[PDB]
Amino acid sequence: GVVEEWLSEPNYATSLVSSLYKVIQEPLEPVCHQLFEFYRSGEEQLLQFTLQFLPELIWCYLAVSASGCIEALLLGVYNLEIKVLSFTIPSLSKPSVYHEPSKVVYSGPHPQREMLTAQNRFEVLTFLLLCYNAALTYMPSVSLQSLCQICSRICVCGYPRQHVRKYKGISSRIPVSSGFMVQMLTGIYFAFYNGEWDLAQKALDDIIYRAQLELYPEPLLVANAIKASLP
């Protein structure tokens, strides 16, 4: 209805969102194509418009994966974004803007992928989540909520805690990379101090839970830091 009207329809950049969410959850093609077309254009606001639907798209992809448009969209955006992301590490021995007394790479370089495979898909998803974290301030509260709920659901899906959380649907353990959980923790940390305290709490707890089950040192480490830093 409204979605179709949106399809048929700079000024453009400046209920529809909910309906689009419902389209993503329920198993679509023109929505994915229009979102990819949004990301293809230069204007950043459209990039942000697609970026809010990113977590729900990822969750849908993984959910379908447990038991062809969304994967195409994610992969397309992935190729669109991929570049080497490096930051300098400060030294106190050198005069700084704040006081008087080497480049390191955290992401890159990622290769272009025509197809999603079991190994590359989480490099892809982790990188996409990093891109999501890069523009976190411009993200609406609803998208942050979806992010938290989805991190939780992914973390506890095939595990006993799912039943405790009363998540209903597919109960299959989704294999997850460590870096993915780290990138989760970035967004969850952001969500904590932007009004979504409770959902970020559950998400954090579940990330710690899964990181303990998966025996992942780094997500457990960061999440432990976040939990300890909490007031």
Partner: protein, 537 residues
């Protein structure tokens, strides 16, 4: 005087934040001016600007104020203020700001051009002025999201001094160590963490994980796995125990020890699987131990289960293919390998198995093409991945040996030898080439070299023993083959060599025993040893 005057004006006006700003600036200038040649009004004037700025809901102005106060030249009085301020601003940077929103402290809304950079800077300055626990958490966050775990381990190591034996900092230090790649120290700190808290099974599980891995401290791993023994962590515990037992069995010296440890591993894996029938790790590793025990049908069943749980697990698919090859179903095995490869194109191990399977049912050309493919993949992808390249060339060499072309085999082995000249694999292949060319003494010496480098290389033992057998030195050949049997009793070629030796000596009963064992073993021999699949937590 003027500073406290503007501050007082701000107070009486309680527009206000402006007076507080001016009061602050003049206060800093006044303090510096003093130092060249404590205030209540000065404190309120300095501080209550950014306070009302954040109360207003305006973040940009607050950040600006923080940066203004931090850019001021350090005075021996403003040091603590600058500490708390730097900490708070670092917090705000990490939790309330992203990359696309960040702007340089010099820029209008060393100078850090990025968010994490400035945050890190402020945290480091804070820790430095703190000399003589939140900042370290923030450091773990900032370095955690950026994967800088070594520097993190160093920072937390700098944090260990002030601290008593408390749980959080030590556990965090251990985890940072594990993430950084420092396995041993991590294991120690983890032992101390089990000392601090025996509630959490994650800690001994992590220790066991490290011990089972590169360190190869199997005894310690057994200890931790025992220490672990909720249903999930008990499952994980028996799983780790089984992995340890299996690895120990591989390392075991005698057949008795080997069989005992393999049975124990089997029991622990069965228990782990019955604790959690959804954990595909336990199911898979159970199936793997069963494969190792040459119980192919059972192994197939539990592989089918493990795959029903996780259909795209590379190890599960690979084990399926190896089990199929064990039943001499080479084409089906190859199909399944090709499937896993359609899911895992970069996987070298899968590709090696593809090479062997193609040599078994498709022919030499195909397997050589798979070798060239592996070579291309290796070039595109690029410690020791050099061993992988050497193995590519050596596999090509095995293909050429299989055909009967000593020249090309010599070439491929020569590439491998350019990489590792005294690899026991290379030496063995030089022996194979010598046998192919007919020079048996040269072959003998090459296998001797190989066993000099790797005294347990069963293939070299087989070949050397065979050569000695053809020379007439039966006792020596037999002794060698007995050692070989101890190294790997499932090696049917060893039992055939042994049966031939015993038969030559006139010991017919024992010889036929050997031959029978060889037949039963070759009945369930996979194209690639099941142990090629790593046993890791």
């Amino acid at each position: 005087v003027i500073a406290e005057a503007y501050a007082t004006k701000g107070l009486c006006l309680e527009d206000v934040i402006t007076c507080y700003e001016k009061a602050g600036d003049i206060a800093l200038l006044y303090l510096q001016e003093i130092e060249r040649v404590l205030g209540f009004f000065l404190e309120t004037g300095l501080q209550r600007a950014h306070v009302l700025y954040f109360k207003n809901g305006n973040l940009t102005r607050g950040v600006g104020r923080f940066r203004e106060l931090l850019r001021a030249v350090e005075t021996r009085t403003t040091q603590n203020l600058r500490m708390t301020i730097a900490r708070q601003l670092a917090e705000i940077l990490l939790r309330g700001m992203c990359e696309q929103s960040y702007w340089n402290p010099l820029e209008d809304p060393f100078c850090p051009q990025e968010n994490t950079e400035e945050a890190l800077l402020l945290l480091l300055i804070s820790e430095s002025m703190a000399n003589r626990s939140v900042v370290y958490d923030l450091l773990t966050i900032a370095l955690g999201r950026r994967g800088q775990y070594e520097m993190l381990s160093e920072c937390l190591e700098r944090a260990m001094k002030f601290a008593f034996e408390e749980f959080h900092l030590w556990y965090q230090f251990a985890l940072s160590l594990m993430a950084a790649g420092k396995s041993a120290r991590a294991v120690k700190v983890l032992k101390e963490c089990i000392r601090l808290k025996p509630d959490d099974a994650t800690i001994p599980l992590l220790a066991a994980k490290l011990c089972m891995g590169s360190l190869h401290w199997l005894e310690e791993a057994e200890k931790f796995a025992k220490t672990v023994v909720t249903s999930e962590f008990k499952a994980k515990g028996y799983l780790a125990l089984g992995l340890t037992y299996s690895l120990q069995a591989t390392d075991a010296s005698l057949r008795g020890m080997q069989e005992v440890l393999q049975r124990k591993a089997l029991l622990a894996f069965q228990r782990a699987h019955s604790l959690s029938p959804t954990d595909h790790q336990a199911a898979f590793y159970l199936a793997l131990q069963l494969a190792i025990s040459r119980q192919i049908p059972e192994a197939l069943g539990y592989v089918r289960q493990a795959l029903q749980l996780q259909g795209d697990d590379a190890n599960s698919l690979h084990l399926l293919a190896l089990l199929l090859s064990a039943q001499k179903h080479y084409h089906d095995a190859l199909n399944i390998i090709d499937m896993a490869l359609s899911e895992y194109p970069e996987n070298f191990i899968l590709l090696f198995s593809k090479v062997k399977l193609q040599s078994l049912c498709r022919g030499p050309d195909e397997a050589l093409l798979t070798c060239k493919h592996m070579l291309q993949i290796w070039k595109s992808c690029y410690l020791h991945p050099w061993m992988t390249l050497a193995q590519i060339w050596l596999h090509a060499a095995e293909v050429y040996i299989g055909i009967g072309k000593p020249a090309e085999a010599t070439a491929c082995t020569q590439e491998a030898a350019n990489l590792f000249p005294m690899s026991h694999n290379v030496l063995y292949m030089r022996g194979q080439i010598a046998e192919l060319r007919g020079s048996m003494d040269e072959a003998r010496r090459w296998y001797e070299e190989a066993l000099a480098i790797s005294p347990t290389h069963v293939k070299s033992m087989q070949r050397l023993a065979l050569i000695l057998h053809q020379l007439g030195r039966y006792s020596l050949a037999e002794k060698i083959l007995r050692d070989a049997v101890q190294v790997n009793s499932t090696a049917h070629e060893v039992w055939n060599g042994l049966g031939e030796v015993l038969q030559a000596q006139g010991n017919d009963a024992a010889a036929t025993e050997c031959f029978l064992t060889a037949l039963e073993l070759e009945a369930s021999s996979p194209a690639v040893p099941f142990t090629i699949i790593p046993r890791v937590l």
